[PDB]
Symmetry: C5
Subunit: 99 residues, 5 copies
């Protein structure tokens, strides 16, 4: 809420808050990352896909899985696994059971 952070994911810059990253849930890699490496703009470097990082950060923001038509849910699942957000993994699995 008060502490602003910038994340360099794969070359794309996201801006968020520490509170968003460490809360809901605190038991993910992401949360333990921000409590390393610095790029040329101060942002913290992450070697993943930013295209499939959007729904991850959004789910961190409001706890809901929202995505546009045609977007492969497998990538989102992969990134969710990497960062270790369990709830989103479950939601994604019950989402891929019936597509």
């Amino acid at each position: 809420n008060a502490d602003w952070l910038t994340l360099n994911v794969g070359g794309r810059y996201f801006t968020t808050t520490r509170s968003t990253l460490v809360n809901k849930e605190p038991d993910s890699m992401l949360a333990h990352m921000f409590k390393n490496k610095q790029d040329h703009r101060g942002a913290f470097l992450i070697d993943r896909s930013p295209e499939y990082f959007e729904p991850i950060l959004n789910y961190l923001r409001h706890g809901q899985l929202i995505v546009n038509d045609g977007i492969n849910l497998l990538g989102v699942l992969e990134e969710a696994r990497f960062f270790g957000i369990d709830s989103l993994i479950e939601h994604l699995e019950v989402a891929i059971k019936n597509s």
Copy 2:
């Protein structure tokens, strides 16, 4: 007349204060003209939301109409509409999702 830049999720939007304050003024968005969110390096006011689902919001602020392209999940628009507190667009969106 008075131009503002917003940093939403890492994406920069340029508009005017008039667009944000007017139509409608009983949202937190309009209330953000009085808040310690101003400082990034380009002077843009920081907002921790999805920029992808923010463009229809700003456009609705610009011309009072809901326009999005095919395949766009307007649930994500509804969530932003709730967060920023634009009630008219919330209604618009609900009657929009009633039959899709």
Copy 3:
């Protein structure tokens, strides 16, 4: 003569000639005959996503868009900026979609 436009946050670049020749009767051409930001770009409080087909139509006089984009979005910028011919093209385009 080169100009840069800041539309809704997105920077487009085009000659003044394209903005003024064809569509000499509405606000776009009338703006550029002679308010700016740091990069010297002319500020426009509209949607850039629906602004690209407008500028394309200014460039070669044709309405070309990919599958899925809402023609209403293009029509709203077309009304705002005031390109009559493109408004006609768009209306006859929405007649049968």
Copy 4:
């Protein structure tokens, strides 16, 4: 020749080589442009659409027409005519004959 060139197309920056812009289309406007109008970043200014310019540049790169679903081929055809690359014009016309 074989210098790294930057093109400012419609406000979007593309990076390539002179070789790519000259060879496999020596009889086009593009090739005729780069043998010897710059913005501040030194990029050469082109007043066209970048969204329909990427497939053009790609065709320059590997001589093939590749485009995602839903992309209007007409927009590519117009740029194809403007830059005067006849082979790609032919490809495009036989591509629009059956869509």
Copy 5:
């Protein structure tokens, strides 16, 4: 893991690690970053004259060894880049992917 690199592909900047570029395909031309590539822009990114739009799935496959793209994406554009950079496994994967839509 520790060594960060920026690639300028066709004008678009990707950021990754040398580890990702040289492991899980050390015999592809990309592994020419197994040494340090003496062509750099002003920012310092290594220049590559290809399409960035079809470079995303390549780099992602380098990252987690899986072919993941959204609906409507022309797989041919990915195949061309895979051929250029010389990732054979991805070429096989793509070939068995295209012969049945």
